[PDB]
């Protein structure tokens, strides 16, 4: 519940105001550069469907994962920063990211 980036951003973005979400990834890239991944390398999603795409380059990402001691209302996260390729599932028109499948 106290001031590291993940506790702060999970609350501000309305992920932990009414529950503790176990994991979430934030991508520190411009929205249009993340939207550009939907026309990059097509791959299978973890679920086997094929509307997933992997970024050609690594992107700056922060992984937020609940500690073993986190309990609503006191959600607590471990913050891990990394540069990884992201895999997103895309839908619609415009064909835009709707789910974050993984980082690699």
């Amino acid at each position: 519940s106290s001031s590291n980036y993940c506790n702060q951003m999970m609350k501000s973005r309305n992920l932990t105001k009414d529950r503790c979400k176990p994991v979430n990834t934030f991508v520190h890239e411009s929205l249009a550069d993340v939207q550009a991944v939907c026309s990059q390398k097509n791959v299978a999603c973890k679920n086997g469907q094929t509307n997933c795409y992997q970024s050609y380059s690594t992107m700056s990402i922060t992984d937020c994962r609940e500690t073993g001691s986190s309990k609503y209302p006191n959600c607590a996260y471990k913050t891990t920063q990394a540069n990884k390729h992201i895999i997103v599932a895309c839908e619609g028109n415009p064909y835009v990211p709707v789910h974050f499948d993984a980082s690699v």
Binding site: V27, E29, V96, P97, H99, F100
Partner: peptide, 15 residues
């Protein structure tokens, strides 16, 4: 209310 694309942005983009 929020589309799936809007929800992705709110939950995962921090430009």
């Amino acid at each position: 209310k929020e589309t799936a694309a809007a929800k992705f942005e709110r939950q995962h983009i921090d430009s």
